[PDB]
Amino acid sequence: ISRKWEKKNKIVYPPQLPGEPRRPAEIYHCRRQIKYSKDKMWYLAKLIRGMSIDQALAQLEFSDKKGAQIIKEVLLEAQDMAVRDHNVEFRSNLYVAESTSGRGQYLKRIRYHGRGRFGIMEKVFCHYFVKLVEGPPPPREAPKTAVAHAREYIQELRNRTITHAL
């Protein structure tokens, strides 16, 4: 197996020089061997990507999925860790920077079919990884406007060269 999301939380940075902007705190947390499915957990992980922690908890409280409670507990433990261990005041000043889900070790069973046939049934397990960064959530990217489209097209036209001409 591999356990690096946990050790990602033990790196220490050198002290900051007077004048350098304050580095935002990054908190890595994870839950291993969840009975939920990998893709069904990826859906809930994608739901709460880039959102504030309070908004993510508000969405997960009313999500009807089973992994919603697991992700909510993981987010709450990550907030508690960020407040206690790391020097992070304003416990509501965290946003979900990274939120993905990986697979775990499966359990192989037999699924009977009929006429003496069977199938390989896989009891699936998943991991949920989350990363909380101190600060306001980054603004959502807006779709490209017509002015930007026209600018990019004009620049593409201006970048042309006479090919195989020299």
């Binding site: 859906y43 809930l44 994608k46 739901l47 969405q59 009313f62 999925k65």
Partner: protein, 110 residues
Amino acid sequence: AAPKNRRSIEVNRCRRRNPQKLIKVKNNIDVCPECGHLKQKHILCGYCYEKVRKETAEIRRQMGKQEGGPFRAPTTETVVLYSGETPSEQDQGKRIIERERKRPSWFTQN
């Protein structure tokens, strides 16, 4: 029918990452002005409803302990009073349940 070829990860992602399959965000979430917990604008508050449900379960437990039988239902109205309360002139003649707990702030005397 059997599949003719293996579907690639590209088409698989295009299928199961379409916004039709993504979880939609809910915009009807608000806070409860009483306890501060989260609730939907069209649904009762879970915390307050749990409080009321626990109080109702206790009241029903006591009112069922009062009636030693399964088919013994009162033919008159019922009134629940808490510690330090007395039945009024309008509440007399009804069945009386007495709770040792003090009257909650949300339960109105009426």
